[PDB]
Structures are given as C-alpha cells and as structure tokens.
Amino acid sequence: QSYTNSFTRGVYYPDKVFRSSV
Amino acid sequence: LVKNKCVNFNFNGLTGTGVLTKSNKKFLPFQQFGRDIVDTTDAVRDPQ
Amino acid sequence: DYYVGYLQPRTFLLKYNENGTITDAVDC
Amino acid sequence: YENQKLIANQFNSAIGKIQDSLFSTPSALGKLQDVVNHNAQALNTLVK
Ligand SMILES: *[C@@H]1O[C@H](CO)[C@@H](O)[C@H](O)[C@H]1NC(C)=O
C-alpha cells in the first residue's frame, strides 16, 4: 500500500564460479 | 584421483588436460569451478 | 511488513573480494 | 675559465633537480608504460 526505493538491495551471485580480486 | 601428473580429467562434465595439485584457495560452499582474469578454469573442487 | 520488486534485464559490474565474495556492485 | 666554479655549481644543482623531478612526478614515463600496457591489452584480448 506504500512505496519505497531500493537503495542497493537485490544483488545475487550470477553463477557458481569462484573469482578472486577481479 | 591422481596428483602431480599430466592427466586428462572429466570432473563432473568439465574436461581438460593439466597437472592437478593442492590448492589453498577458499571456496564458498556453493561454487564449483574457478576462473581468473583470462577466464580459464584454474581450480576445480572434487565432485566426491 | 514486506517488500516486492520486479527484476529487469540489466548490465552490472561486480567486485569480487580475494575470498570470492561480491562487495559493492555498481549499476551500468 | 672565469666562471668555472659557478658553472659547476649550476650543473650540480640542475642534476639534483632532475633527480627530484623524476622521483616525484609519476606521469613522466608515460610512453614506456603505454607500450607495455598496449602489449598486455593485446595479449589479454587475444586470450579472451
Ligand atoms: C579472507 O580469508 C582469510 C583467510 O581465511 C581471512 O583471514 C580474511 O579475513 C578473509 N577476508 C578478507 C576480507 O580478507
């Protein structure tokens, strides 16, 4: 019934690949 | 599984040739593969 | 007491930590 | 033959100023770094 803004939420891991400092 | 030998591998459908040694990298308990800036498989976890 | 949002096809730049943990993603 | 000492002092000061200028400014050696970066970028694109 109300409205807000998503500051930075909603980021998930795209796949199952490990990456280090990239 | 053999180590320190140039041996073809078929880890869970991932196929290639190389030398398989011990890794000190830390994996989150959902990641299977491992890449780098060049985007090549650098480290893989044992399916077993 | 909950929020609902819809996903759209975007392009994102993600920064992985040495221990491969996503920190501070930036939109495009 | 008349201003030998003055000229020597001027040269000595100039060489020190050159050393300080090279030490301080990091963008002086732009060309060599650009060549290295271009080669690295070409190799990275080729492998990618
Ligand atoms: C990464 O892993 C190492 C080793 O477990 C740990 O010491 C460190 O705190 C972890 N996190 C960061 C951000 O370095």
Q: What is the DSSP string of B9-39?
A: EEETTEEEEEE---------TT--EE--TT-
Give contacts of A17 with chain B, Cβ < 8 Å: 31-35
Give contacts of A4 with chain C, Cβ < 8 Å: 3
Question: What DSSP letter does each residue of A1-22 carry, written as one string?
Answer: ------SS------SSEE-S--
Q: What is the CA(C18)–ligand 1 centre distance, in A?
A: 8
Please tell me if residue B37 touches chain D, with a CB cutoff of 8 Å.
yes
Q: What experiment produced this structure?
A: cryo-EM
Distance CA B37, CA D45 (A): 11
Resolution in A: 2.9
Distance CA B46, CA B11 (A): 7
Please tell me if residue B43 touches chain A, with a CB cutoff of 8 Å.
yes
Burial of residue A19 (number of CB atoms within 10 Å: 0-12, 13-18, 19+): buried
